[PDB]
Design a binder for this molecule. Sequence first.
Ligand SMILES: Nc1ncnc2c1ncn2[C@@H]1O[C@H](COP(=O)(O)OP(=O)(O)O)[C@@H](O)[C@H]1O
Ligand SMILES: [Zn+2]
Lengths: 210, 506, 536, 105
Amino acid sequence: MRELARLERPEILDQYIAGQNDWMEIDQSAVWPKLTEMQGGFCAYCECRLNRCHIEHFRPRGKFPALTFIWNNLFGSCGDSRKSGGWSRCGIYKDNGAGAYNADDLIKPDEENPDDYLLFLTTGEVVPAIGLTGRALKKAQETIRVFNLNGDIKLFGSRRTAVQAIMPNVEYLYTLLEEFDEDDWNEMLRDELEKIESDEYKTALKHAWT
Amino acid sequence: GNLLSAFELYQRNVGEWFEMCRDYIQDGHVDESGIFRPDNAFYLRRLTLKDFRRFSLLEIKLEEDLTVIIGNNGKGKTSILYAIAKTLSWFVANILKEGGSGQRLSEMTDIKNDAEDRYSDVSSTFFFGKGLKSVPIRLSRSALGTAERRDSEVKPAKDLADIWRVINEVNTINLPTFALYNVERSQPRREERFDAYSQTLGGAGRFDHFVEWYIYLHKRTVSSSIKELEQQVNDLQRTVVSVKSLLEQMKFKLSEAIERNDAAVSSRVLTESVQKSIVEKAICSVVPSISNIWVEMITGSDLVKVTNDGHDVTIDQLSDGQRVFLSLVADLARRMVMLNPLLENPLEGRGIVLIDEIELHLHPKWQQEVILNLRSAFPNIQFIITTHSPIVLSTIEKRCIREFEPNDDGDQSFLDSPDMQTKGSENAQILEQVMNVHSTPPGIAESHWLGNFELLLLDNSGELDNHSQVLYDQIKAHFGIDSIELKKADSLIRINKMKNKLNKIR
Amino acid sequence: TKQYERKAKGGNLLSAFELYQRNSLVGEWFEMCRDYIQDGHVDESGIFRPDNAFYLRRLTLKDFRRFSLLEIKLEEDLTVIIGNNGKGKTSILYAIAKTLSWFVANILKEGGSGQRLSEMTDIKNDAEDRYSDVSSTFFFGKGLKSVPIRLSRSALGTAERRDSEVKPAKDLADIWRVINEVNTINLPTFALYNVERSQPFNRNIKDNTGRREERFDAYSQTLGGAGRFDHFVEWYIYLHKRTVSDISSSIKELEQQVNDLQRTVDGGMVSVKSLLEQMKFKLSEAIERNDAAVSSRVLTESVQKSIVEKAICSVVPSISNIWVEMITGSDLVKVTNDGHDVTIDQLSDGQRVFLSLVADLARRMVMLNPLLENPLEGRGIVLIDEIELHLHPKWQQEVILNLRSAFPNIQFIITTHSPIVLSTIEKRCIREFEPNDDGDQSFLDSPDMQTKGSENAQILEQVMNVHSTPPGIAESHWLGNFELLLLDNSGELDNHSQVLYDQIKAHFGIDSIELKKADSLIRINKMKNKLNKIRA
Amino acid sequence: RREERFDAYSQTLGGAGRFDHFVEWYIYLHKRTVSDISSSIKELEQQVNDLQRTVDGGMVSVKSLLEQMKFKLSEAIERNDAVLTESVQKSIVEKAICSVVPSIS
Ligand SMILES: Nc1ncnc2c1ncn2[C@@H]1O[C@H](COP(=O)(O)OP(=O)(O)O)[C@@H](O)[C@H]1O
Ligand SMILES: [Zn+2]
């Protein structure tokens, strides 16, 4: 899960007002390009490559009708409700699978940095970060539960596979700490971390490298 | 080039229309690969199930060549094959006899238990060339004790089958093969062309039938004008002690020639020697690790022998998996030869074949081979198969695969292809991405030790503390010094040590 | 004698029993035998454990079928036999089943005969000695560490006959039978489940003659290979009817009817005397059956029902509930399968076959272990051929765990060709069957690799000798070829390597494992080259 | 097994005999006798000789058959050349039956 840089509000959200208007009315192709700018064609919660995708309200439209055409509440999630099929993580699972949850105790990735709450073990699991107590632990534990970031085998399997593929390159770089001097080695680590902006499951790959 | 209109004109009247119908059925070409291709292909295009068993509504589009249906137990894979088989029974019945009746849906079992509208529908659409783009058939049944009965709609199946039957009666044509091979395949008068349709949609593929048939064909084919043969028989009879065996053989040949001569045009058949050769070739081409099959009588008992992985063995030396599969292929080949006498290669005939649990009783080794050569040997058959095997799926393109979602509560409208390409993929990936199973068993504690070990290393700034050492020793003790798990643990130690050293060099 | 007394006081079961038989301190010796059989403890997990366990330790086959000599050591809990040659694996299970027939026969009837070896099929065709032996050694606590049994058969016209040696098995079975006759004890379960268990279910179910209610019906057809799922259904419906009915109300009603009939005969109607005698007989029979049921110390039908239902629901993942519905003057067993209420005949073949196995086994255990709080914690030996038959991979990952949890004291001897099943089992439990061209093999080996908790891909390669990728598909070799090309061209993407890279990308996709591995190879080789240049 | 020597005692005092066992045993004997190539060569040699005599007697119609049989004989000889007890056993029984049973020649 990445810390996302939200910046500019698109023009179409000015027109539509809560109460009168419905999400069925608004055009979705108007909204996407700013989210694609924000996120980089990657899922907000799991960091899949987006292809089947939907606009996700972080607080849902039923419970919170105030936050229906508000730019802070919107996110590009993976999975497609329209298709005849079962999707079991992120936006779709938050509604259907997880069921009962407090919305306040979840990581909103535009506001908060995930890195302090979540840790990505190279065996493939996401866990609470080392040393959390009480409330911060509860947010980490519920973000993991409600977005189903372990419980989906497709996601877990895809994420493990990716990290395990690079672990030869991780071990080989840190051996050459010794013989290289600091300016050579710090340029190399910058160069590897440059690549993984364009890669799937980037936060998991980050924790493997650093 | 509408086939039904041409046939109607033929029935009312005449040679021109007959020829048009015959050419529509018989015309084809040999492609670049040397394979005969009918100009007008016959296949099942679409299937819809409404309130049938577990399905409230299901729609399936089928591939022309191969469709593999996958899912957990109780997802309805067998139900789908049953539905198709019952539909195909209407073609078979009407090819055999005018106004013949096919099979029907059960009022006890086949209606969905909580269907508000207490009836079930199986709707199928078949394709037969550009002249007959859509042949819709619907099988319907109302639940027991309902006042209002829903009628099946089968006339299009009957009409099409009538064309095959009538044209064949006048001039021999090639006919489509329909066969179902269910899980019961594993359970322990002369021949005539339409015996190929006997028990084709249940009871086909039984090892014992093959062996008996094969020995029979061998005995007949061990060791040609009728007038010339009659003259030879007469000359041999006049000579008749040592030539008595030869006379009996020649009398048999004469009787067979007369029978063939007397036999009707519709029931035209290839020689027993040719039939034998084609079946042998089919078996050897398709079945993993069988290069040759033959009959021996030199012990003094009739024994079918095979060359299995370069060793000549009795057929009773085959595993049950290999026997069952051999039986399936042999049976299919036999039917194809009987129904396609006019083709150079009768195995290039048309048809629809259904196979349930293709991997039944197969060791992983042979699972890797079984679908490699099925499509090569039978290029114009539409195969609709079910499997539980990731090894099988590793040999098949994703376009051929139709998967049920794991959390399907029987509502979903379409079966779809997996997102990942399966052909040439690792089995571990297919397990996780296609079959929704972890590569390691989650119920085993030892499966989590490496994860736990990593967490302990990260908690203690990368240094091997007392607790991490204990777990390391457990991993080493359990998996062994040469294990992949221990190597991963060692790797974690090395990386974390180096990371920590860097952190100190702040 | 004094010697028998010493051995018996030392804990020898046979000596104690011999003293019991001769004197029939008779009560003391009986109690010693009964305590040897019945004593046990509850472990820390809350599971009952007999103090004196019963299991098959060793099996030897001599000139049997394709085996000149084969020796197998079995585990107390679980042994799994793996290999291609399934006709030899099945022969091993058959040999065991025939031996187990001797215990079953003698528990049922004094001097009962088990099954014998065939002169035609069981003797190896090229045996010099022209006879066959099946030797088994059983264990029954520290008091009886070795119970040897040998089944033998000679060819026709041999100078000397080979007789079976079965007396130890008979002696042990006699202890169970005789002690049980005096005071009800728990008895061992023996069952074989072959590939035959996959048979179509005949729905129309037979009227209760009441053989199915008898305790020793648990041994009926127990080593036949299919089990009797039909018997389960009959027995289960019977249990249901008894639970809905009141018990001894028929006796009370019969008591009232006999009293009314007695008054009529006392009132001068001598014509009804014949009917009174018939009814008195019926009453006496009902009381006796009730008393025998009372004497057999058997569990209430309600409790029996509950135990079996729980077992089925626990072991069979798709089944959450099972019950009897009374409709149309015809009792139907229904199940909740995947959240939907269906008849047994509506179940998938995989579900039904597995249900049948567990149902049959649970029924037998409940009938044979009436004195245990959990009757499924009884003793016994169960043989299962091709346990993965009809099971999806997800079920294969749970099947052994579920069985072993439900039946903690049963010795399971099973065959499989599933790596997924093997991933849940320790290598010590695994015996590999790799025969020669003649079918002959001397010992069965544990694999070198630990299987429990290992990845299935590794088991495929290291245990089952199957590649992770299908060798007869070209695309399976592209990554290997790609790597070779990279290594040949000093780590730089040449025209050939680039083409293949593009092919991999086009075929497997941008987010494929294969492409990621290729990308990894490029990155590592580029870094290796940079290091080489710095060093130069 | 019907060819096992002690099968001769199988249901011997049961009253019916086992005529079914005879038939099976006789077919077995036949198959074994056909299979050995030297008797087949001798039989083929005899057939070739009989056919050659017919061709020499003016029946030109059987020349095609003679050529086929000569080819079969040459092939059999080429396949490795080698008395079967089974052949003798068969002959003994045939003679016995024909001698004792008047209507059977
Ligand atoms: N009439 C029915 N109503 C509801 N569910 C049914 C009915 N008949 C069968 N089923 C369900 O259908 C499933 C069996 O489908 P089947 O084709 O045998 O499965 P599989 O795909 O494993 O072969 C089970 O879940 C069973 O409960
Ligand atoms: Zn997502």
